[PDB]
């Protein structure tokens, strides 16, 4: 009745795999066509798809009508400038003059404008959809932000397109003490990953700032998650790390759905639960600590960690330690206290929100 209740939840989540894989092929077709149009613009010359996120991390449990798409764009010779003491928000400057780089049209005086660039990006996708008489793909006129472009394929699939800059540079100094995988995935692996580029997605806190993004590293360490190189590659090594992340994601989803009226949980996201999960992985580096037989025990440790972040109002970004995702400024004290009472109730009543 214990971990077997959770096993039955995970079995129910497999039924939606065929509907999610069908709808992912719908999005890929649309996104691949938009990528060809974006490649025609000399500003979006180096544009490419970044195959990161829940679907590619094999943790896309539910919401077959909701997808998130990422688009990279190589920005060579970059110059960063930390916005205030927000260790994740930066200003994008250029190491060499405007004639050299093609993004020069979006420069708002030595500083790249995220609003000037996202408006061009939106304008291209909009005219591409308008030119094509297909009544299936429709762009929704949103409030702003990033993903600033949100599409609706076949009047059902909502897609969230995000634009990101790729910097093949050394990661910013704010990430110096982040990614604590040395005793789990190894010091060799941490060195290897830190040589890979980092991304910058437009996000305010000055409106012309960009937040650091490591969606690729998150995918890389989720699909190679064990200390043993052969983890989940055979019957004797099937761990429950991904099952736990799936269950934490589903716990937040169902709680958000249950309280979609008194909206306290709308500030919470599947990224908060993913970030907390990576911290639980750092606390439990052995594959012994993630046995398939101990699913109940492992999921309970994931819930307890998340409860501690809500109670202490502290959830560090896995890559930028000084960036507190649960800071009083990003999420208020009352929303965190409300979620704490709901997770405490769920944990105490054998999780009724999962049940049929
Ligand atoms: Zn494994």
Which residues participate in the annotated binding site for GTP? 52, 160, 211-218
CA dihedral 213, 214, 215, 219 (to 10 degrees): 180
Q: Give the Cα separation of 231 and 239 in Å (integer).
A: 7
H or E segment at 138? Answer: strand 138-140
Ligand 1 centroid, distance to 25 Cα (angstroms): 27
3-state secondary structure of 161: strand
**CA-CA distance, 96 to 93, in Å (whole number)?**
9
The resolution in Å comes to 2.8
How many whole angstroms from 347 Cα to the centroid of ligand 1?
25
| Residues 115, 231 contacting (CB under 8 angstroms) | no
Other CB atoms within a 10 A radius of the CB of residue 185 amount to 22
Method: X-ray
Neighbours of 313 (CB within 10 A): 16
**How far apart are alpha carbons 31 and 37 in whole angstroms?**
10
Distance 306 CA to ligand 1 centre (A): 21
For residue 329, give Cα distances in angstroms to 8, 144, 150, 262, 335: 38, 20, 27, 20, 12
| Pairing of the two strands 157-163 and 66-73 | parallel
Residue numbering of the annotated binding site for Zn(2+): 225, 231-232, 239
> Using CA atoms in the order 42, 46, 52, 55, what is the torsion angle rounded to 10 degrees?
50
Those residues whose beta carbon sits under 5 angstroms from the ion ligand 1 are 226, 231-232, 239
Calculate the CA 164 to chain-centre distance.
13
CA of 239 to the centre of ligand 1 (A): 4
CA distances from 275 to 130, 149, 305, 346 (A): 38, 25, 11, 21
């Amino acid at each position: 009745m214990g971990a077997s209740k959770l096993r039955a939840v995970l079995e129910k989540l497999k039924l939606s795999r065929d509907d999610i894989s069908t709808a992912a092929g719908m999005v890929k077709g649309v996104v691949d066509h938009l990528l060809l149009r974006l490649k025609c613009d000399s500003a979006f010359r180096g544009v490419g798809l970044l195959n990161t996120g829940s679907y590619y991390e094999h943790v896309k449990i539910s919401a077959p009508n909701e997808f998130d798409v990422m688009f990279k764009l190589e920005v060579p010779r970059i110059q960063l400038e930390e916005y205030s003491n927000t260790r994740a928000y930066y200003f994008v400057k250029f190491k060499r003059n405007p004639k050299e780089n093609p993004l020069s049209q979006f420069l708002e005086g030595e500083i790249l404008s995220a609003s000037k660039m996202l408006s061009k990006f939106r304008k291209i996708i909009k005219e591409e959809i308008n030119d094509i008489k297909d009544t299936d793909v429709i762009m929704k006129r949103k409030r702003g932000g990033s993903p600033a472009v949100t599409l609706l394929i076949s009047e059902k699939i909502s897609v969230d397109i995000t634009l990101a800059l790729e910097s093949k540079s050394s990661w910013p100094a704010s990430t110096q003490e982040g990614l604590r995988i040395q005793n789990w995935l190894s010091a060799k692996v941490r060195k290897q990953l830190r040589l890979k580029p980092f991304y910058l997605v437009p996000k305010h806190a000055q409106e012309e700032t960009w937040r650091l993004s490591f969606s690729h590293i998150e995918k890389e360490i989720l699909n190679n998650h064990g200390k043993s190189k052969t983890c989940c590659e055979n019957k004797e090594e099937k761990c429950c790390r991904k099952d736990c992340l799936k269950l934490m994601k589903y716990l937040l989803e169902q709680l958000k759905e249950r309280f979609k009226d008194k909206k306290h949980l709308d500030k919470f996201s599947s990224y908060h639960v993913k970030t907390a999960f990576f911290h639980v992985c750092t606390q439990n580096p052995q594959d012994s600590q993630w046995d398939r037989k101990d699913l109940g025990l492992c999921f309970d440790n994931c819930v307890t960690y998340f409860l501690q972040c809500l109670r202490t109002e502290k959830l560090e970004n896995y890559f930028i330690p000084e960036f507190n995702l649960f800071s009083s400024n990003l999420i208020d004290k009352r929303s965190k206290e409300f979620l704490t009472k709901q997770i405490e109730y769920e944990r105490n009543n054998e999780f009724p929100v999962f049940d049929e």
